[PDB]
Ligand binder design. Sequence first.
Ligand SMILES: NS(=O)(=O)c1cc2c(cc1Cl)N[C@H]([C@H]1C[C@H]3C=C[C@@H]1C3)NS2(=O)=O
Lengths: 49, 49, 10
Amino acid sequence: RDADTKIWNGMVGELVYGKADIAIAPLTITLVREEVIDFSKPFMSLGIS
Amino acid sequence: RDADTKIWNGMVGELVYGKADIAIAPLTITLVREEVIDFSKPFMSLGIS
Amino acid sequence: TVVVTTILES
Ligand SMILES: NS(=O)(=O)c1cc2c(cc1Cl)N[C@H]([C@H]1C[C@H]3C=C[C@@H]1C3)NS2(=O)=O
């Protein structure tokens, strides 16, 4: 989310504005993203390594 | 769930029937549990070791 | 048709 404009850009901003129906992407689950859209249960685990 | 009488047991059985408002537990997110009661995103990760 | 949006990353 661009902070002052409060617009979502990218794959989530495509899911927010109704252009796309689903995203199967390397899209990490984040609290700022969870407020605006839905997520499935995660399918793959990753951490700082 | 055991299909001899098709009855849920344990903590999920208290969730489905109405005894439980929440089950914060070592309750593994599965498929047959997800269909009858909700899970959030998992709070702790593990596997068979 | 269900729209899949993805990003290009190997
Ligand atoms: N340290 S840990 O293994 O208890 C652990 C385990 C997990 C954490 C974070 C930690 Cl610190 N968050 C991940 C993430 C996936 C989605 C659910 C919670 C966040 C978003 N889930 S997890 O895999 O359940």
